[PDB]
Write a protein that binds this ligand. Sequence first.
Ligand SMILES: [Mg+2]
Ligand SMILES: [Zn+2]
Length: 643
Amino acid sequence: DLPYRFGLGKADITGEAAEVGMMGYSSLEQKTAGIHMRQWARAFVIEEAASGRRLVYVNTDLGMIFQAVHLKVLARLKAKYPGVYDENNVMLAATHTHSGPGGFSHYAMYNLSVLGFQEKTFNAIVDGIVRSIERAQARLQPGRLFYGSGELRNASRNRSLLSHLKNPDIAGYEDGIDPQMSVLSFVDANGELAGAISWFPVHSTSMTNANHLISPDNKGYASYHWEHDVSRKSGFVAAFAQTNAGNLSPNLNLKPGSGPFDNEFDNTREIGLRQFAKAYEIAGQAQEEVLGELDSRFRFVDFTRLPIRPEFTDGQPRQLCTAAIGTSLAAGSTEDGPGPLGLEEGNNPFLSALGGLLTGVPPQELVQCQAEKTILADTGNKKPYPWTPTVLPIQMFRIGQLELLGAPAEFTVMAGVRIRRAVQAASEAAGIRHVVFNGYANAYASYVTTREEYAAQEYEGGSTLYGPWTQAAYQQLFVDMAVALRERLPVETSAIAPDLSCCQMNFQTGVVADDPYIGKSFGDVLQQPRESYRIGDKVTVAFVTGHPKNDLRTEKTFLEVVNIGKDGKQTPVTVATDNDWDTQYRWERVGISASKATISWSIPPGTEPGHYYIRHYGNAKNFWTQKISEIGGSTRSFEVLGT
Ligand SMILES: [Mg+2]
Ligand SMILES: [Zn+2]
């Protein structure tokens, strides 16, 4: 028989496509205005031979998975699958894409630029994650797990080199880059690649703060290219996860010119391509088969004044400071949007309802505990609720000789490396040979910098919430969890994660009413395609539509490129959907309450020469009935010429 069983599942988690602040850039003005490609939850269920011990890892095309999401999906999994799933064996991570709708956190600080909690996006996310896990378990099949690694030196650059070089122990990271990519491949009973999870550090910020189209960014393109363009086996699921990318940017030049590009879409595709290429090469090598038990540990840790043993600090006992954000340099900002929550409370009704950024003075105890940080906002002391998390999840999965760490924050290269070495040192005797550090997991508590980097207070340091010893605390938490795994004892009793579902505000307007263009009806074609197009041309079409906020069209689409044959009379077969890289769905307000759906298609090489037409699906809400109806239209047919 085989050592393991695995199940690969995928579900739509795309949020509100129009008029909701995007998550990542903290830009008040960056609201969704369409979709380039959808966001997906990719679940990997791993079962272990004799026992049916189960582990679930889900990587999401999101900026991060906030505590609110974690708490909700687990509550559903625990209630619906009692005894099989709980916080011990469910890990949720994010690719950290900055092109998705926000508002799915329960902490004000992360909802600031979005003007609050966006329930519709939040629920689409928890439901999609749960759905991906149900689909993955439903596809449990026997197989083998392989682990391998390689180096990728051309897909990232350190955005805070000055701080990075402050670390004495950077042997192997002299240029600021963590070139290591790890790949856990899943091979079915026929020795065929069923899926894979690739781990490699680099912000998914190829799409800038000027973009308004939803997008999985570079990691999402890598996933897509493998699933849609490369793999011929279906049910194929490829996830591209993060490790320690706190100070790693994909824009190789310094903002929106990665390698030599000048273009964010080209940059997104190329960076995704390079990550895909490396992962594909590594997976093909099937370097080291994974074998051994499956195990896990989870613990909610209250960070408030958490005791840090002298061996992780400078030789003296320390206690974590309550959360605070300090100022730092940019100029505009940098790795893309506006910065250190300098969202000006003027156009922010949500910010003023909270009481402004600053309120009174941070206690003198907080000021010195925070050391070199010059506090801009004391988020930990905010009332009635702190704007940042205080109880955080620490989780480790043992998968054979592999240990997967789920860390609730963005860790700089060295912040993660140190934790990795420390955990690897503690797990050696247990048979662990590879420690995979997965940041952006289970919750989001900003940045983690090493004591040294923190002292320089560059962007990541300013956002290292709990003080100079935040990195040390995390290293102490993961080491203690690792020793527990090694000794087979429970980890300490979990603290309680605050449930904030009760007090969420929202100042972002929903859909009031939709109206067709004057004299038109929803679904009407405002712009018909040209008579014919050649391969490589971009077909642009437009429709009278309704606000996409009315319906996410989860597991569905706002458009379809349909092929009706060489003579135009064959059974219509759809060749492109709103998820595809080749298509784009854009929404724009026209008049007072009307709106336009602009759909574009870049005919890709390999397109069957023939007749095609574009179909649009939308939803419109009526003011009088408050009813949301389905709407749509289809353009006339155009011809695709062999080229
Ligand atoms: Mg698309
Ligand atoms: Zn980041």
